[PDB]
Amino acid sequence: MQDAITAVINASDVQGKYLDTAAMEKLKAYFATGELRVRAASVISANAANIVKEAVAKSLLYSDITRPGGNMYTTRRYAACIRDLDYYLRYATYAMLAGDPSILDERVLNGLKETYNSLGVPIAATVQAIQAMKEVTASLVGADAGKEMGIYFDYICSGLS
Amino acid sequence: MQDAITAVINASDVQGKYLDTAAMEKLKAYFATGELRVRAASVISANAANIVKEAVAKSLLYSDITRPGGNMYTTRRYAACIRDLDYYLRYATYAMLAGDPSILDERVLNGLKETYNSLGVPIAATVQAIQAMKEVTASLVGADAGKEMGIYFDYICSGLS
Amino acid sequence: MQDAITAVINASDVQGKYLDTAAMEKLKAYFATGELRVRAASVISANAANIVKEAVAKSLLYSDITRPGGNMYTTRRYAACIRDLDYYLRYATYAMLAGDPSILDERVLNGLKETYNSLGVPIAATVQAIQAMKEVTASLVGADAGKEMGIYFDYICSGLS
Amino acid sequence: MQDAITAVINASDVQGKYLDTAAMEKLKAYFATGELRVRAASVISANAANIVKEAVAKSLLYSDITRPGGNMYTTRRYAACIRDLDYYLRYATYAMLAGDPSILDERVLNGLKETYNSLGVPIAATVQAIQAMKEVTASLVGADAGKEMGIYFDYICSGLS
Amino acid sequence: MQDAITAVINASDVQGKYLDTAAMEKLKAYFATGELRVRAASVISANAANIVKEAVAKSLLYSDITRPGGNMYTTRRYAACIRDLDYYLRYATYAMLAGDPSILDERVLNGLKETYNSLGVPIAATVQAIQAMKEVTASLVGADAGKEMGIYFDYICSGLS
Amino acid sequence: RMFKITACVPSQTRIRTQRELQNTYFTKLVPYENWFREQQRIQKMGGKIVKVELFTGKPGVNTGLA
Amino acid sequence: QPLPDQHPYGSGNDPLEIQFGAIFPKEKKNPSARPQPFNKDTRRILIARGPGINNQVSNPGARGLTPGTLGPKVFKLDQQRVIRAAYLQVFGRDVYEGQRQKVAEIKLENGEISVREFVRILAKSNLFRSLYWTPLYVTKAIEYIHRRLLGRPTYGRQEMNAYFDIASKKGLYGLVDAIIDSQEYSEAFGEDTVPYERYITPQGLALRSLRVGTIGETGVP
Amino acid sequence: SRALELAFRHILGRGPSSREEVQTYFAIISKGGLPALVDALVDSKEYSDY
Amino acid sequence: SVVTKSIVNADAEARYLSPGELDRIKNFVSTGERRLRIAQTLTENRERIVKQAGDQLFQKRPDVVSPGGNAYGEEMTATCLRDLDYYLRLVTYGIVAGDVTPIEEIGLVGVREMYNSLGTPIPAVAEGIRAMKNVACSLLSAEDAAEAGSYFDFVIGAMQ
Amino acid sequence: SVVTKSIVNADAEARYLSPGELDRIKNFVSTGERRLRIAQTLTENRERIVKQAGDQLFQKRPDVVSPGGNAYGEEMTATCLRDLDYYLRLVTYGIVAGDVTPIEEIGLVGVREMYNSLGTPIPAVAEGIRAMKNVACSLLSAEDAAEAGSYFDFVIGAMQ
Amino acid sequence: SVVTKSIVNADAEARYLSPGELDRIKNFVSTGERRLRIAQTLTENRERIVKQAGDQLFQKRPDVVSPGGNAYGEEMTATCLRDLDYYLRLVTYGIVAGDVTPIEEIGLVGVREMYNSLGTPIPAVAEGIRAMKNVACSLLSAEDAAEAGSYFDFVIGAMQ
Ligand SMILES: *[C@H](C)[C@H]1/C(=C/c2[nH]c(/C=C3N=C(/C=C4\NC(=O)C(CC)=C4C)C(C)=C\3CCC(=O)O)c(CCC(=O)O)c2C)NC(=O)[C@@H]1C
Ligand SMILES: *[C@H](C)[C@H]1/C(=C/c2[nH]c(/C=C3N=C(/C=C4\NC(=O)C(CC)=C4C)C(C)=C\3CCC(=O)O)c(CCC(=O)O)c2C)NC(=O)[C@@H]1C
Ligand SMILES: *[C@H](C)[C@H]1/C(=C/c2[nH]c(/C=C3N=C(/C=C4\NC(=O)C(CC)=C4C)C(C)=C\3CCC(=O)O)c(CCC(=O)O)c2C)NC(=O)[C@@H]1C
Ligand SMILES: *[C@H](C)[C@H]1/C(=C/c2[nH]c(/C=C3N=C(/C=C4\NC(=O)C(CC)=C4C)C(C)=C\3CCC(=O)O)c(CCC(=O)O)c2C)NC(=O)[C@@H]1C
Ligand SMILES: *[C@H](C)[C@H]1/C(=C/c2[nH]c(/C=C3N=C(/C=C4\NC(=O)C(CC)=C4C)C(C)=C\3CCC(=O)O)c(CCC(=O)O)c2C)NC(=O)[C@@H]1C
Ligand SMILES: *[C@H](C)[C@H]1/C(=C/c2[nH]c(/C=C3N=C(/C=C4\NC(=O)C(CC)=C4C)C(C)=C\3CCC(=O)O)c(CCC(=O)O)c2C)NC(=O)[C@@H]1C
Ligand SMILES: *[C@H](C)[C@H]1/C(=C/c2[nH]c(/C=C3N=C(/C=C4\NC(=O)C(CC)=C4C)C(C)=C\3CCC(=O)O)c(CCC(=O)O)c2C)NC(=O)[C@@H]1C
Ligand SMILES: *[C@H](C)[C@H]1/C(=C/c2[nH]c(/C=C3N=C(/C=C4\NC(=O)C(CC)=C4C)C(C)=C\3CCC(=O)O)c(CCC(=O)O)c2C)NC(=O)[C@@H]1C
Ligand SMILES: *[C@H](C)[C@H]1/C(=C/c2[nH]c(/C=C3N=C(/C=C4\NC(=O)C(CC)=C4C)C(C)=C\3CCC(=O)O)c(CCC(=O)O)c2C)NC(=O)[C@@H]1C
């Protein structure tokens, strides 16, 4: 649970040094991008359900995954899958606000692959859906903030894979 | 492993459509920068050793990391650390040539957090070193190649984080 | 707990097709064996205490196990052992009614070896006592049900070993 | 592996300090214990098979472990168990010679608990067996080095637990 | 939790023997030395803060562990260390009163090495601190009960090692 | 808004030795949000609260009541 | 072999059954994972920290019969130290001096609030959140909270998914109230008793009971 | 056991395929150690064939 | 024991033994010598107590020893008298330990289940233990007999 | 930081960050330039702040430097000044973060426990931090000192 | 208000208002004039915003006014427009407050349940409020409209 500001100061703290000028430059960078990050976060908040719905339609619906015997087929499984996509999008938004994928590490990816492998969830199909969510999010929040959201979606994909 | 051409062709192939004009534009951009990519790659190959030397001197050297018990103390550990910086540079060069980050995800980032967390390697210090390598490399190869190589260095940095 | 009917309908559901005539044949078969299964379950329920009393007397009583230091010595441990024999009988009866070993797999045998090995319970003696219960049960419900109660009791013994 | 010498020097190396006078006292103590340790190692080396024989008799044999379905039943498994007990004896004697339990931690304990739980090996019986080995070894090598062997035998018990 | 008195009676129970002359001699010894044990427990109870203070001073303060980049650095971490040192002292006093290390095994050492390896706590430094407490409490409670305490403090040290 | 009510909860007959006086007569403070659960528990007990009052002065504010 | 005793989601979701700490295996630090496929409604075999005759699987009625000398101490409030016990059970350690909720949440001494509500206050407090919700992957946190608030490790996926939908839609506060409002918290621990450890997984009993000094005779005649 | 699995990777270019393989070569590494396991894996027909 | 009772209560609250707890331990260790003596009389006379109490039980509850009863024949009457010996042994453990926890752990948690599985009549077992209590009181001095009688009383209460 | 506190509350309530919390983050990122400037002045003058405030602490509380006090002798006084330097470093961190949680995480949680163990008097340490606040206020402009003083005030309040 | 929410939250922890919360209420005080100005201009256009946004809602979703839609008939169309007006009234309250506490309590908690009982489609309500957000943004000053859009975003996000 480190944001960019906390990460900068934490590294300084471990070294035992007052904030250096280079660290000030890194903090300035976070403050500089803050406005676009906050704006995109509010946009995702408003369109949260739609982002997930579009991603499911773009990557998962009318496919082997949702047709009978595909592990998203039963209604309980469909509800579970969209719940997980909601979880991914919410923590990606938190990560964009903070500037750090550490929240994704601690709250999503610390045991996710083992749970998915045990349950039988197809990792590749989830990765496809998360990638589609990246495309939809980029359109909704704008390309400039879309690059920022993209890195955190990629973090989820790298950990999940 | 996928280069940009492989990704474009495969996306078109899944859809079933012949290569569309927008896809042609993406491929055309990659081909157009081909001369710059090859030129920069040769520069990296020639200057790779000094790129690493400068980057280690910039951040890791004369630091707590090289102090006794700092995890680059031992001569073993120092040699391995500069090797890993060589790895990141080499695979960043591969990623630049291909134009896609799949090399980084397939070979560099499918065991990186496991290896580094198991060894105790300090991720923050590695991130600082790779950022320093990005700056040194950008100076040697010029701004256009500094931007391209920079995105792949950033990929490795965020993945390590 | 999947039974024969639930398993048949589930398999047809996975394929996606409505219930086939062949599936109807299988369901008719289970309905045919319903009379023996229900009758045997009623017999087991009424005589459950006597089944366990006879099995304990035949196999476990007046041995080292029931004498000081034998793991059935303490009054606590004796009551726990008879409770475990009741467990195996009850879930074997559930399995016979269902026509499916899924309940045994899911609830009874999962981690049974690990719990017993952690507690110090002799798994060899538990297997022998379950065999004694199998013989007593076979006598009480007759060869028709004893054949089936045999397969479910032996399922427990195979897993427990 | 770290023996006592290597542990002392590595502890000093981590701080970065030359070997202190207190560290010299530690090393001198190890050198003082050297004769009794080497003598005891030769005793165990010649009497290794007898130690395993006596221990398996004292604890493992004539129990539910060796009755059919008890995990040590079958000649394959009885051979395997005596092989594992000799593993413990050999590494424990290595540890007596070196003076540090790092051999046990590196070559025995790490991962053994998971493999044993996977294979179904009773873990209580293993602990009781190696404690029985401790009793036999104390008799053969004498009390003073039996004091020493016990430390490493107990280390193995704690790791398996 | 099992005293020496409960241990004696439980051993006789396992053998199915009434308390014999030898075990009754064991009990007579414990009852006789109980007065010394009780008084020492009162002494450690009153001087718990002082014992922990002096031990932290003798082995842990003014060193790498307390300086930035060490474990005890940050008030959070330092408070945790003194808390754990008091836990080791309090449970050692429980064990002295009882006459058995079982309280330490069940409540303290039941995973301690794994927890400290998970958090990165230095096992060697913890051992040094506990041995420092051993010295200080020996001074406070006197030599006669200091030896009786020392065996249980050494038990904790061995477990954490 | 927390509602405080006194209930002589009907005897559950769950006391052998032990003690049931504290359960038998209850004066408690209950949040208005959690008062529904309290009413359900009173139904299980079998005794309605003899007296019911609400600490907050006004029962309803359509907006910003909190 | 048949299925193991691990949490259905994975081996990593099993905390060390220690006094306090929430020490879960990390998926990446030292790679170790045994993903075994667990069905929708399996049930863990939970050893009872008490007498095995009193087990919720076999004696479902006798939830609330005290563990006795064979189990943990059971603190019940009569009308003191229940407050201390509630801290030592909801968190595990006695909390630091500034971290005490103090009389602001301790109206229990006055009698305004029952012990069920006191543990709900402590469970929703910011200290508890920071310790056992913020730094832990979700299902690992759901498990640890279930073990701290209810006495027992989670049985299976029937419970994890039901306590996971609640968490996804309401967070730590919703999950905490679901656990504390559950029928099992009222059946065992009632509304007057501090929660206590009622069950342990077999590899928690392995850690406690098979070290030299606790194994005694357990394992061979 | 882990040493055996790593040895299969390095010297034979694959991982153990069955319990019979693990039983066989765990016995080998038990009876002769690393020199024995190295000899067994290189001697194996599988090495010569591939 | 009493040491364990004190330590368990202290451990739950994470506090060193309170002065009152330590007072109880000091009393118990000071009284230990007389406790061991009382237990020793019971162990030394272990045959008399069982034999005479067995006769009293069989007189008062003749149905158990009659043909068709649980303890019919010397083969099964031997097992009944053995159980009476078991409970005398548990009582001696309790006298030494100073608590009923030894008795309750070894032989009172689940007696209803165990004996109801063996078919034995538990009220008759209770009569047997009461007979042992009376016989033991004959052997012991009045002050000591009161202390040992408490442990016998716990056993009979548990089996009622 | 404001961002991390907002995320923590939203995470614990399963809530995309509320508009008000987003507004708080917006104001904080804008004031970033002023925040970093204030931190730069404080770290540049850290030597003067610690020295002057340490003199004030010893003058106001002679007992801490008197015999029997915690900071008696040159080395003990040096460690006391180092602690004051630590707390100033924490205050600079807090100013940059815009939240007191970096100060709380590092050095303020369990401070009573740590200093009670060390033998240090907590209110006396609070006097030292109060003196540091006065010196920093002299080195800062009025608008700057009000914001930085609030972080000093939290430190003294928690360590009161 | 932000002050009221902050005071209640601090009361729960029994803490005097922390420096960050003091800063937040300080900024609320500072921006009060802009808040009142935004409320006044939106109130001036209150009828216009609702009516034209309602037209946009109907235009985007023809099923709303088609047979089988809840807003069928002129009276039901009036009720739908009234709901848009209700939310605008709450949004202006919330803009004045600086906090979503009014918006939440008055008209958002249980909105799914209320509209489910009525038969109304909450997703259709969401599209209508989105149209209101755009219309209000155009009428409001662009810099001020950025802040108001966040509060409209909260309302539409809660709808589902
Ligand atoms: C018909 C009464 C209403 C309606 C439906 C509608 N459905 C879809 C698409 C899907 N429906 C499902 C539902 C199920 N999957 C299941 O496994 C089960 C139970 C066995 C159910 C009920 C799913 C999974 C999909 C999508 C993926 C798929 O290929 O099945 C749509 C299309 C959604 C879209 O935008 O693409 C629609 C419109 N429409 C109506 O008007 C009725 C009120
Ligand atoms: C959706 C893109 C894909 C998919 C997923 C799917 N997941 C589940 C069930 C679970 N998912 C999780 C995941 C998480 N837990 C977390 O804490 C986090 C981080 C916040 C995540 C991502 C968990 C724990 C479960 C278990 C709950 C349970 O008991 O099921 C299912 C349900 C499986 C079932 O049988 O019910 C599914 C289907 N499925 C797909 O087809 C997509 C490709
Ligand atoms: C001296 C005889 C020759 C020489 C050496 C020289 N070395 C450095 C810098 C470093 N040297 C080390 C060496 C070690 N690190 C280790 O862990 C060990 C084993 C315990 C050794 C030997 C390191 C780490 C550094 C980097 C700085 C640091 O310690 O952090 C320099 C400075 C290089 C520079 O310009 O940066 C020099 C000059 N130089 C000579 O002329 C001799 C022939
Ligand atoms: C340097 C910036 C930091 C650092 C590094 C360090 N690394 C190692 C050891 C390993 N590094 C790797 C990583 C890779 N292996 C790969 O094949 C690739 C490319 C695909 C990468 C990135 C691995 C596998 C190891 C371990 C095996 C080995 O020794 O090579 C060490 C050694 C640790 C040890 O003692 O065992 C170190 C010290 N150290 C630093 O201080 C920097 C911050
Ligand atoms: C005698 C007063 C009454 C009675 C008893 C009776 N008991 C048995 C058989 C068993 N009794 C036990 C009891 C214990 N096991 C323990 O560990 C302890 C505590 C230390 C006790 C009390 C057990 C285990 C058995 C089983 C046989 C065995 O020991 O292996 C019998 C024999 C019953 C049979 O049919 O086998 C009898 C007769 N009978 C009476 O009439 C009295 C009222
Ligand atoms: C008899 C022909 C010869 C002989 C044998 C002898 N054996 C033992 C003890 C044991 N024998 C076994 C054997 C097996 N275990 C198995 O799983 C299988 C295959 C299914 C076999 C054959 C075992 C396990 C034991 C140990 C005791 C036990 O069973 O638990 C003894 C006793 C040895 C002792 O002193 O303890 C003897 C004497 N002895 C002869 O003289 C014959 C030539
Ligand atoms: C000065 C204002 C007062 C005072 C203090 C005093 N402190 C110590 C010793 C230590 N102080 C610390 C403090 C911290 N450790 C941390 O990690 C942090 C947060 C980052 C803080 C604030 C520590 C660790 C020590 C121990 C020594 C060490 O640093 O290793 C002393 C020395 C006491 C002794 O004998 O050990 C003193 C005197 N004394 C005063 O008079 C002031 C009122
Ligand atoms: C002090 C001598 C050394 C030290 C220790 C240290 N420990 C922790 C944190 C924890 N300690 C435990 C340990 C126990 N749990 C138990 O049940 C028992 C026995 C009753 C013990 C000993 C646990 C579980 C934790 C983690 C949870 C927690 O913080 O309490 C820390 C803090 C580490 C952190 O990340 O917060 C420290 C620093 N550190 C030292 O420097 C000494 C050498
Ligand atoms: C009887 C044939 C043998 C025997 C058994 C014995 N078992 C236990 C204790 C436990 N057994 C279980 C097993 C289960 N738990 C379940 O929920 C189910 C249903 C699927 C099963 C099969 C468990 C969990 C325990 C632990 C205590 C408990 O029930 O909670 C004991 C008690 C051990 C103790 O020391 O308390 C005993 C004695 N013992 C024998 O001698 C027979 C060979």
Q: Rounded CA gap, J87 and J153, in Å?
A: 12
Which of E64, E124, E159 has the CB atom closest to D158's CB atom? Answer: E159
Non-local (6+) Cβ contacts of G55 within 8 A are C83, G48
Burial of G22 (0-12, 13-18, 19+ CB in 10 A): buried
Q: Which residue in this structure is represented by tokens 């040590």?
A: D72
> Alpha helices, DSSP H only, in chain C?
4-15, 21-46, 48-55, 75-98, 102-103, 112-119, 123-160
Give the end-to-end CA distance of chain C in Å, rounded to a whole number.
23
Which residue(s) pair with F3 in the sheet?
F30, F54
- Among chain C residues, CA nearest to D121: C117
Q: E134-137: long-range contacts (C-beta < 8 A, 24 or more apart)?
A: E135/E55, E135/E58, E136/E50, E136/E51, E136/E54, E136/E55, E136/E58, E137/E44, E137/E51, E137/E89
Q: Rounded CA gap, A101 and A91, in Å?
A: 9
Q: Rounded CA gap, D1 and D106, in Å?
A: 7
Give D14's contacts in chain B (Cβ within 8 Å): 68-69
Q: Where are the beta strands (DSSP E) in K50-96?
A: none
Atom of ligand 6 nearest to the CA of D62: 30
The phi, psi pair for B143, rounded to 5°, reads: -70, -45
Q: Rounded CA gap, G2 and F53, in Å?
A: 59
Residue E18 domain boundaries: 1-161
The packing angle between helices A75-98 and A143-160, to 10°, is 120
Task: Give how far G161 is from chain I: nearest CA, Å.
Answer: 33
Q: Is G219 on the interface with E (CB under 8 A)?
A: no
Q: Which residue in this structure is represented by tokens 């474009």?
A: B8
- Cβ–Cβ below 8 Å for D63 and G207: no
Give G205's contacts in chain C (Cβ within 8 Å): 118-119
Non-local (6+) Cβ contacts of K71 within 8 A are K58, K64, K65, K77, K79, K80
Q: Which of E52, E75, E82 to mutate to test the pocket of ligand 7 (most atoms within 8 A of CB)?
A: E75
Choose among B125, B136, B139, B133: nearest CA to B153: B133
Exposed e or buried b for every residue in J147-156, given b needs 16+ CB within 10 A? Answer: bbbbbbbbbb
| CATH classification at residue E89 | 1.10.490.20
Distances (CA, A) of C142 to C54, C134, C137: 16, 11, 8
DSSP state of I66: S
For β-strands F26-31 and F2-7, DSSP reports them as antiparallel
The phi, psi pair for I6, rounded to 5°, reads: -60, -45
Q: In chain E, how many domains are there?
A: 1
Which H or E run contains F51? strand F49-54
Q: Is G112 on the interface with F (CB under 8 A)?
A: yes
Distance from Cα G69 to the centre of ligand 9, integer Å: 19
Query: Half-sphere exposure of residue F43, counting CA atoms within 13 Å on the CB side?
Result: 6
Give all chains having 3 or more CB-to-CB distances under 8 Å with chain K: A, F, G, J
For β-strands F2-7 and G47-48, DSSP reports them as unpaired
Q: Rounded CA gap, J130 and J153, in Å?
A: 8
Burial of C102 (0-12, 13-18, 19+ CB in 10 A): middle
Cα angle vertex G24, ends G22, G28, to 5°?
Answer: 145
Note whether I130 and I57 are within 8 A (CB): no
- Cβ–Cβ below 8 Å for D83 and H30: yes
Q: Is K101 on the interface with F (CB under 8 A)?
A: yes
Which H or E run contains H19? helix H19-43
Ligand 2 binding pocket includes A132 (Cβ within 6 Å):
no
Ligand 6 binding pocket includes D69 (Cβ within 6 Å):
no
Non-local (6+) Cβ contacts of J143 within 8 A are none
What is the number of the ligand closest to the CA of A110? 2
Which of J19, J22, J102 has the CB atom closest to A9's CB atom? Answer: J102
Q: Cα Rg for chain C, rounded, in angstroms?
A: 18
Note whether B153 and A151 are within 8 A (CB): no
For β-strands F49-54 and F2-7, DSSP reports them as antiparallel
Q: Rounded CA gap, E24 and I61, in Å?
A: 36
Note whether E145 and E39 are within 8 A (CB): yes
- Cβ–Cβ below 8 Å for G70 and I9: no
- Cβ–Cβ below 8 Å for K160 and A49: yes
Q: Which residue in this structure is represented by tokens 């498990």?
A: G143
CB < 8 Å from F in window 66-105 of G: 78-79
Q: Is G44 on the interface with C (CB under 8 A)?
A: yes
CB < 8 Å from D in window 61-80 of B: 67-69
| CATH classification at residue I122 | 1.10.490.20
Give D115's contacts in chain H (Cβ within 8 Å): 1
Q: Resolution to 1 decimal, in Å?
A: 3.7
Q: Which residue in this structure is represented by tokens 């300035």?
A: A28
| Three-class DSSP category at F30 | strand
The packing angle between helices K111-118 and K122-139, to 10°, is 120
What is the number of the ligand closest to the CA of A76? 2
Binding positions of D:
81
Q: Which residue in this structure is represented by tokens 């927008």?
A: B22
Binding positions of C for (2R,3E)-phycocyanobilin:
81
C-beta neighbour count of K155 within 10 angstroms: 27
Note whether J115 and J125 are within 8 A (CB): yes
Ligand 3 binding pocket includes B31 (Cβ within 6 Å):
no
Task: Give how far G82 is from chain I: nearest CA, Å.
Answer: 9
Atom of ligand 5 nearest to the CA of I77: 38
- Among chain I residues, CA nearest to E2: I4
Choose among G121, G117, G74: nearest CA to G100: G121
- Three-state SS for chain G is CCCCCCCCCCHHHCCCCCCCCCCCCCCCCCCCCCCCCCCCCCCCCCEECCCCCCCCCCCCCCCCCCCHHHCCCCCECCCCCHHHHHHHHHCCCCCCCCCCCHHHHCCCCCCCCCHHHHHHHHHHCHHHHHHHCCCCCHHHHHHHHHHHHCCCCCCCHHHHHHHHHHHHHHHHHHHHHHHHHCHHHHHCCCCCECCCCCEECHHHHHHHHCCCCCCCCCCCC
Which of C117, C118, C124 has the CB atom closest to D69's CB atom? Answer: C124
3-state helix, strand, coil in chain I (%, to 5): 80, 0, 20
Question: Which pair of tokens denotes residue J108?
Answer: 């303020």
Q: Is G17 left (phi over 0), alpha (psi -120 to 50) or beta?
A: beta
Q: Rounded CA gap, J31 and C62, in Å?
A: 84
Q: Which residue minimizes the CA distance to atom 35 of ligand 3? A: B57
- Cβ–Cβ below 8 Å for E75 and J108: yes
Which of G69, G75, G88 has the CB atom closest to I14's CB atom? Answer: G88
Q: Cα torsion for I60, I64, I65, I71, to the nearest 10°?
A: -140
Which H or E run contains F53? strand F49-54
Q: In chain J, how many domains are there?
A: 1
Non-local (6+) Cβ contacts of J12 within 8 A are G129, G133, G134, G171, G172, G173
Which H or E run contains F3? strand F2-7
Q: Rounded CA gap, K143 and K37, in Å?
A: 13
The phi, psi pair for F7, rounded to 5°, reads: -130, 125
Exposed e or buried b for every residue in G92-104, given b needs 16+ CB within 10 A? Answer: bbbbbebbebeee
Burial of G41 (0-12, 13-18, 19+ CB in 10 A): middle
Give J11's contacts in chain A (Cβ within 8 Å): 94, 103, 107
Distances (CA, A) of C48 to C35, C87, C133, E38, I70: 20, 11, 10, 53, 21
Q: Is J108 on the interface with E (CB under 8 A)?
A: yes
Atom of ligand 1 nearest to the CA of A60: 27
Q: Rounded CA gap, G194 and E112, in Å?
A: 26
- Cβ–Cβ below 8 Å for K106 and F66: no
Q: Which amino acid is at H7?
A: A
Q: Rounded CA gap, I123 and I117, in Å?
A: 15
Residue J34 domain boundaries: 1-160
Q: Which residue in this structure is represented by tokens 């997930």?
A: A52
Ligand 1 binding pocket includes A78 (Cβ within 6 Å):
yes
Ligand 1 binding pocket includes A119 (Cβ within 6 Å):
no
Choose among B33, B9, B51: nearest CA to B148: B33
Ligand 4 binding pocket includes B130 (Cβ within 6 Å):
no
